[PDB]
Amino acid sequence: VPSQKTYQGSHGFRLGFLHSGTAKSVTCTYSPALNKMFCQLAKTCPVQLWVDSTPPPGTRVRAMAIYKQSQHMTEVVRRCPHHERCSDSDGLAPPQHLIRVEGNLRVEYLDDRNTFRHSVVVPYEPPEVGSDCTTIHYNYMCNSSCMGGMNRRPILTIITLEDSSGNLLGRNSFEVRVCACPGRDRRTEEENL
């Protein structure tokens, strides 16, 4: 199955997130204790790419989802039959892909010919002048509860840094939950310590 081991690499690639608290109006919140993001369906999910040194030109940023429970690791994560037959395509994203990228016309989606894994990839751009990180706005187009796709199984998002030719430059990952009230659910799952 696809690797998830953290790999910071020669460019010291770390992921970062906004520190949004757990108020009820929050659309997306990340738990450092759980290394877990909670987000709402289809809402903007900013993910920060932090690098100790800028990767070469033509570098690409790939996102992929896998099931976290070993007994579901080989099953391909994808939207439920209800949501892929939905009318929410942006004209770029395949109707079956869980993860989309927003606000970037150079986005590319892949169905692996041999693994069938889904992924979405964008060009890597360096941080905005006067900033320390590059931000990508991901969207999760299917709830963790969709009794038809994820069916309440936790998933991992694997963020991979690769050169123009697809060689791995770096890898990080975070657990994700797509729920109606991210703030409530984060506070509750941390109530479990």
Kindly state the smallest distance separating residue 138's Cβ from Zn ion, in Å. Answer: 16
The answer to the question of residue 51 lying near Zn ion (CB under 5 A) is no
Per CB under 5 A, 155 contacts Zn ion: no
Q: Which of residues 106-145 bind Zn ion (CB under 5 A)?
A: 142
Smallest separation (angstroms) from Zn ion to the CB of 52: 38
137 in a known ligand binding site: no
Per-residue string for binding with Zn ion, 83-112, x by CB under 5 A?
Answer: x-----------------------------
- Bridge partner residues of 101 (DSSP): 138
Q: Is 146 in the site for Zn ion (CB under 5 A)?
A: yes
Which parts of this chain interact with Zn ion (CB under 5 A)? 80, 83, 142, 146
